[PDB]
Amino acid sequence: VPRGSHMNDVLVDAYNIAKDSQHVHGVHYIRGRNVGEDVHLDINIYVDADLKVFESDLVADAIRRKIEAEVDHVRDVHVGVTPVRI
Amino acid sequence: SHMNDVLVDAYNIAKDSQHVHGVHYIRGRNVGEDVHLDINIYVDADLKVFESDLVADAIRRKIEAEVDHVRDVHVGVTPVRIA
Ligand SMILES: [Zn+2]
Ligand SMILES: [Zn+2]
Ligand SMILES: [Zn+2]
Secondary structure (H helix, E strand, O other): OOOOOOHHHHHHHHHHHHHOOOOOOEEEEEEEEEEOOEEEEEEEEEEEOOOOHHHHHHHHHHHHHHHHHHOOOEEEEEEEEEEEOO | OOHHHHHHHHHHHHHOOOOOOEEEEEEEEEEOOEEEEEEEEEEEOOOOHHHHHHHHHHHHHHHHHHOOOEEEEEEEEEEEOOO
């Protein structure tokens, strides 16, 4: 039965990294699953529908790298992308 | 306030409720300026369904009552079994 000692830390720090990043029009959803004393994180961000895929790959990747690097007790991070029409 | 406020307050309500052995997961979807909240709690596998309904329901009522900017709070349950 997973110890979620850090759910609150992780969710808040991740959300703040994501919401404020380049070309993110908002966070669609965020999910935290407890795994050991660490957290499995799924985040979905809104981006412009007209953005080209290579740049949305970079946008999502930069957020994954940054969360992984900056937020403790995160065993893994998936960053999905939902197109919005602006 | 939206996501961060709501997620933390809900998690703390849920995690500390009496027949909850831990929080399995928590999900927040942004809907307007409010949050759609899905939260799954670990309970004992041998708890009878009517009581786990009450446990989950009390958490839903409490979050809804105490935590602002929350649309639909769904509280699921995953059985844990020591033995
Ligand atoms: Zn995932
Ligand atoms: Zn739901
Ligand atoms: Zn509202």
